[PDB]
């Protein structure tokens, strides 16, 4: 957690349906955006912090 991994996401087409197709995710909490409208919005500044 003190050295949390930050990964770039750019220049790709992301299918967020496979988040829900296979899902061990007990907590799925989005703050400023709908989860099912994630497939309809085009993004940059996408970061994955694990």
């Amino acid at each position: 957690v003190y050295a949390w991994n930050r990964k770039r996401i750019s220049n790709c087409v992301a299918d967020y349906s496979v988040l829900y197709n296979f899902a061990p995710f007990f907590a799925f909490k989005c703050y400023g955006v709908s989860p099912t409208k994630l497939n309809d919005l085009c993004f940059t500044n996408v970061y994955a912090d694990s």
Partner: protein
């Protein structure tokens, strides 16, 4: 593994985005429609409706 919930390790990952303040590079499998001129249409340009 013998501990109960409240002290078990959870893998937590945060996805961060931005909205519309920059050119976009990532979105979903929605397929493009052809472009029309001089016609009243509702458009979805990179998430901008």
């Amino acid at each position: 593994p013998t501990y109960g919930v409240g002290h078990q390790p959870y893998r937590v990952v945060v996805l961060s985005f931005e909205l519309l303040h920059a050119p976009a590079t990532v979105c979903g499998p929605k397929k493009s429609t052809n472009l029309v001129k001089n016609k009243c249409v509702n458009f979805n340009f990179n998430g901008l409706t």
